[PDB]
Design a protein around this motif. Structure first.
Motif, PDB file in Angstrom:
ATOM      1  N   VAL A   1       0.831  -1.201   0.000  1.00  0.00           N
ATOM      2  CA  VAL A   1       0.000   0.000   0.000  1.00  0.00           C
ATOM      3  C   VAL A   1       0.865   1.251   0.000  1.00  0.00           C
ATOM      4  O   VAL A   1       0.679   2.152  -0.825  1.00  0.00           O
ATOM      5  CB  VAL A   1      -0.961   0.000   1.200  1.00  0.00           C
ATOM      6  N   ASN A   2       1.824   1.329   0.914  1.00  0.00           N
ATOM      7  CA  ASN A   2       2.589   2.549   1.081  1.00  0.00           C
ATOM      8  C   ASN A   2       3.780   2.648   0.144  1.00  0.00           C
ATOM      9  O   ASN A   2       4.367   3.726   0.033  1.00  0.00           O
ATOM     10  CB  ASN A   2       3.060   2.677   2.532  1.00  0.00           C
ATOM     11  N   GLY A   3       4.138   1.572  -0.547  1.00  0.00           N
ATOM     12  CA  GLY A   3       5.148   1.681  -1.580  1.00  0.00           C
ATOM     13  C   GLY A   3       6.553   1.365  -1.121  1.00  0.00           C
ATOM     14  O   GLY A   3       6.896   1.559   0.048  1.00  0.00           O
TER      15      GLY A   3
ATOM     16  N   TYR B  46     -12.088  -5.153   0.107  1.00  0.00           N
ATOM     17  CA  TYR B  46     -10.939  -4.278   0.279  1.00  0.00           C
ATOM     18  C   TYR B  46     -11.262  -2.941  -0.356  1.00  0.00           C
ATOM     19  O   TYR B  46     -11.878  -2.895  -1.423  1.00  0.00           O
ATOM     20  CB  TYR B  46      -9.682  -4.866  -0.356  1.00  0.00           C
ATOM     21  N   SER B  51      -2.741   4.387  -2.898  1.00  0.00           N
ATOM     22  CA  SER B  51      -1.924   3.195  -2.749  1.00  0.00           C
ATOM     23  C   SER B  51      -0.938   3.087  -3.901  1.00  0.00           C
ATOM     24  O   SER B  51      -0.945   3.890  -4.833  1.00  0.00           O
ATOM     25  CB  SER B  51      -2.803   1.947  -2.697  1.00  0.00           C
ATOM     26  N   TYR B  52      -0.077   2.080  -3.822  1.00  0.00           N
ATOM     27  CA  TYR B  52       0.931   1.825  -4.839  1.00  0.00           C
ATOM     28  C   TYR B  52       0.832   0.433  -5.429  1.00  0.00           C
ATOM     29  O   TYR B  52       1.610   0.101  -6.328  1.00  0.00           O
ATOM     30  CB  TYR B  52       2.337   2.026  -4.258  1.00  0.00           C
ATOM     31  N   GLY B  53      -0.079  -0.389  -4.936  1.00  0.00           N
ATOM     32  CA  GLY B  53      -0.294  -1.715  -5.476  1.00  0.00           C
ATOM     33  C   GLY B  53      -1.542  -2.289  -4.851  1.00  0.00           C
ATOM     34  O   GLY B  53      -2.123  -1.711  -3.929  1.00  0.00           O
ATOM     35  N   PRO B  55      -3.020  -5.094  -2.545  1.00  0.00           N
ATOM     36  CA  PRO B  55      -2.554  -6.107  -1.590  1.00  0.00           C
ATOM     37  C   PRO B  55      -3.183  -7.453  -1.801  1.00  0.00           C
ATOM     38  O   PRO B  55      -2.522  -8.467  -1.559  1.00  0.00           O
ATOM     39  CB  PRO B  55      -2.983  -5.539  -0.236  1.00  0.00           C
TER      40      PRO B  55
END
Lengths: 48, 85
Positions: A1-3, B46, B51-53, B55
């Motif tokens: 999530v936070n990278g 979810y 975010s970056y991806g 989960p």
């Protein structure tokens, strides 16, 4: 999530140590301290 | 439950080139009984912002195998050869 760019800033940068080769002449005490170690011996021995 | 198949669907919204502004990932989890009946055990819910991806998929990327249906041969066979085509 936070990278994966952020979590590298969660670990701390540790300091590797190096050697600190000094020369270290024996540590000269102060003169008012040097006369508590040795009492009234002043001016008695000829230094030559 | 012994084994679970997660048949899942996602809805992404972007904020930059590879960051995400929001992720909504829902889906159904499935159990194969010994009497070959498929009953749902539970659900996925979810939802996150900035975010970056994903989960949910990254958990399934490492902790399970995909149900692969496109099974590829070791050496592909040509059907017709020449100029015919």
């Amino acid at each position: 999530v936070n990278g994966d760019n952020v979590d590298a800033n969660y670990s701390k940068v540790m300091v590797e140590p190096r050697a600190n080769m000094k020369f270290d002449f024996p540590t000269l005490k102060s003169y008012d301290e040097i006369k508590q170690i040795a009492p009234e011996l002043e001016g008695m021995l000829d230094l030559e | 439950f012994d084994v679970l198949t997660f048949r899942c669907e996602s809805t992404y919204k972007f904020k930059s080139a590879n960051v995400y502004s929001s992720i909504k990932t829902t889906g159904q989890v499935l159990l194969e009984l010994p009497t070959k009946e498929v009953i749902q055990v539970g659900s996925v819910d979810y939802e996150a912002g900035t975010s970056y991806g994903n989960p949910v998929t990254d958990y399934l990327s490492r902790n399970g195998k995909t149900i692969e249906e496109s099974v590829i041969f070791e050496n592909a066979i040509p059907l017709s050869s020449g100029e015919e085509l």
